[PDB]
Design a protein around this ligand. Structure first.
Ligand SMILES: [Cl-]
Ligand SMILES: [Cl-]
Lengths: 34, 36, 34, 36, 36, 34
């Protein structure tokens, strides 16, 4: 359970970073359509 | 345009799935606290 | 747990709708490519 | 063509992920009754 | 290029989410074993 | 629970196959940018 808690935290952090990165790229791509 | 639209769709799906994942993590943590 | 149940229902419905929308868009995209 | 194919790949992955998420929700609900 | 970059972003998100999913499966199995 | 276990295994094998396919397609697509 201690290892589980650590791994949940690490992956939660990574996914958040990836979603933020994806949101920023999505906005850039939509602007570039013009 | 339609490719970019599809990326918007899939990102939205991923975001909603992340909300579901966070909910399941919360649920397991509550149950773990109790059955320990 | 009452809120948890409510939110599970909300997001499940939303994901189902997004999957349907994405399936529809994939079909349109393939048609356009052909 | 190859971009469109990849959108189909990711869509299918998301669909499979959704089935797994629904399974985990089922498991949590089954345990919740007993553990509370 | 920027569309393919977004596909990399989304695939990485799906993969990380799958890791998190597998962690929740482990958690459910542990709790189930303790109760049933 | 026996059905649950089977279903988890089946969808896990499916998503792993899809992720592998997506990884290969991603590699090809990136090389095609040149
Ligand atoms: Cl995509
Ligand atoms: Cl049973």
């Amino acid at each position: 359970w201690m290892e589980w808690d650590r791994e949940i935290n690490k992956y939660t952090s990574l996914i958040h970073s990836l979603i933020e990165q994806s949101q920023n790229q999505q906005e850039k791509n939509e602007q570039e359509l013009l | 345009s339609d490719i970019v639209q599809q990326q918007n769709n899939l990102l939205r799906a991923i975001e909603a799935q992340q909300h579901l994942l966070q909910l399941t993590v919360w649920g397991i943590k509550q149950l773990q606290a109790r059955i320990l």
